[PDB]
């Protein structure tokens, strides 16, 4: 089981009790997609939902 990591590009505070707080530069272990625009992941031990359009694209 190898890792699937991504990097937060923009901060985000939760609007529902299942959501993660995102801080710029945070590295999330991705679980999967739940809905358009919404992924589940693990960040600092907590599993929760986060907006996928707040994640940094890899462009070199």
């Amino acid at each position: 089981r190898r890792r699937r990591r991504c990097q937060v590009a923009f901060s985000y505070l939760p609007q529902n009790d299942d959501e993660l707080e995102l801080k710029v530069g945070d590295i999330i272990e991705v679980v999967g997609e739940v809905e358009e625009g919404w992924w589940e992941g693990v960040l600092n031990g907590k599993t929760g939902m986060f907006p996928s359009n707040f994640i940094k694209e890899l462009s070199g």
């Binding site: 923009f10 529902n16 809905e35 358009e36 919404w38 939902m49 907006p51 359009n53």
Partner: peptide
Amino acid sequence: RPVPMKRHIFR
């Protein structure tokens, strides 16, 4: 700032 999409689905 980006805009989050609407949500309906949860675990």
